[PDB]
Amino acid sequence: NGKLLLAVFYCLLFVFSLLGNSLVILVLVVCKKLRSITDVYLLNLALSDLLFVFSFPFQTYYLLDQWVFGTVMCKVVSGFYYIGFYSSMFFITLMSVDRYLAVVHAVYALKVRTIRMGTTLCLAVWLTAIMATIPLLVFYQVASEDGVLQCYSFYNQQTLKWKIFTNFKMNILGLLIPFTIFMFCYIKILHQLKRIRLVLIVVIASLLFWVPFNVVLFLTSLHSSISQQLTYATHVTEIISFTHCCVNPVIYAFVGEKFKKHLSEI
């Protein structure tokens, strides 16, 4: 009966994440014109979180009953999930790089920090996320396990290599490179500043949310009795990760003063 409890939890996440992201977008688009470069990345991060938010109801209706939406929806929902993951993971790296460039290279910062750079980098990030997601979708489809429908990805013994390729692609692209960029930037920023906390907290949260998922995926790729606890681990890690979209608006409303100035009014 755990599926019902998981569905209720997904509904809770849906409601809170939708409210938070809607409020963030509302403030950014009504009480400001995104004049600052910092605001464009926040807007794109909120638009990425909404992609996670939109995939919850299908999962809730899948835990109860079964998958009745067909194959096109089976591909599209997974596309939403993976594009959201990749885009939200890259935008944090962009924020970290921007903060480093300001704190350390302030003299040269004035030239780069313009609206055009933000727009171009955001478009590039979105295209990169979509391209990185394309390989996964081609294998998702609907299957009938004796009359019960399910949306899942199936590989033959010939195409099985792409499963390993995609697992390692996810790992290296979405964890190591972002983590390395954070490591390089924030040691220097702390060195300069100790003698801001917002983006540091953002990265640590968004890394601890996804690191168990990446670790379990790494173990799964290496494997390809351990199966049962590995399946339980990946299942729990999915929920562990899901909360990043809900908490990002929480962080931005808690820390940023600009958010408070326009949230207290409403």
Partner: antibody, heavy 121, light 111 residues
Framework: QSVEESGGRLVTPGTPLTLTCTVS????????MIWVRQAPGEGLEWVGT?????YTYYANWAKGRFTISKTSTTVDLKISSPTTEDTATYFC??????????????????WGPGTLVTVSS | AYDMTQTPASVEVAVGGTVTIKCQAS??????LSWYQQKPGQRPELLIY???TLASGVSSRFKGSGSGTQFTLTISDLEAADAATYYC????????????FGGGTEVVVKR
């Protein structure tokens, strides 16, 4: 669960034919449907398959001569231009395990009482 | 591509004997073979799917084994009602396929 075939007839060589397979007890959106043919005194010969979403797959010899369609309750197999070698008993089966792309589509149960088609002048 | 060949075309066996029927695929299939039985003048009936698991309602005298390329079906305690034709069917793929069924093996009960 039950499947019943209809449409067996004596048809001159060249005029199109159409057979129907009516279903009772289960929904077609959940299972795939298989068409098979057996010549008198010979082994089974798969002709075509229709999956959950309505994607048709045909045997190499059957590409271009047969067409399968589905509806809420019935599954139709149309023979565009039968020849004298198309005389046989046609069976309609349900695949219990199947995939939308027709991989892993092994277990066929239940079968139907085949319908006999004859072509001659 | 995947050509299914059944080795014995016809096997004669006495009642209370063991019957072995062999099926083979040109290319490896990861244990996705099903077995069907057809008595004369009747529709086929499923016996085994996934090459090992019995279909509900079928006796325990039928045992399927094998994986990869070779496959086998064994009838342990033959009865006079077991005279029929058995077909092996591969559920691996349906693209560029001439026929998913085998040639069919006929069991004739000795007397």
């Amino acid at each position: 669960q039950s499947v019943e075939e209809s449409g067996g007839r004596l048809v001159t060589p060249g005029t199109p034919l159409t057979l129907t397979c009516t279903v009772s007890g289960f929904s077609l959106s959940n299972y795939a449907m298989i068409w098979v043919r057996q010549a008198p005194g010979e082994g089974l010969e798969w002709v075509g398959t229709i999956s959950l979403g309505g994607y048709t797959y045909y045997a190499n010899w059957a590409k271009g001569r047969f067409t399968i369609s589905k509806t809420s309750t019935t599954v139709d197999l149309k023979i565009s231009s039968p020849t004298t070698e198309d005389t046989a008993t046609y069976f309609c089966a349900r695949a219990r395990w199947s995939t939308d792309s027709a991989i892993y589509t092994y277990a066929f149960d239940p079968w139907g009482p085949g319908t006999l088609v004859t072509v001659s002048s | 591509a995947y050509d299914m060949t059944q080795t014995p075309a016809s096997v004669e066996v006495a009642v209370g004997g063991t019957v072995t029927i062999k099926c083979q695929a040109s290319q490896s299939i990861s244990s996705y073979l099903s077995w069907y039985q057809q008595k004369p003048g009747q529709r086929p009936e499923l016996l085994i799917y996934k090459a090992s698991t019995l279909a509900s309602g079928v006796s325990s005298r039928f045992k399927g084994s094998g994986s990869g390329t070779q496959f086998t079906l064994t009838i342990s305690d033959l009865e006079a009602a077991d005279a029929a034709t058995y077909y092996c069917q591969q559920g691996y793929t349906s693209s560029n396929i001439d026929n998913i069924f085998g040639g069919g093996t006929e069991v004739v009960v000795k007397r």
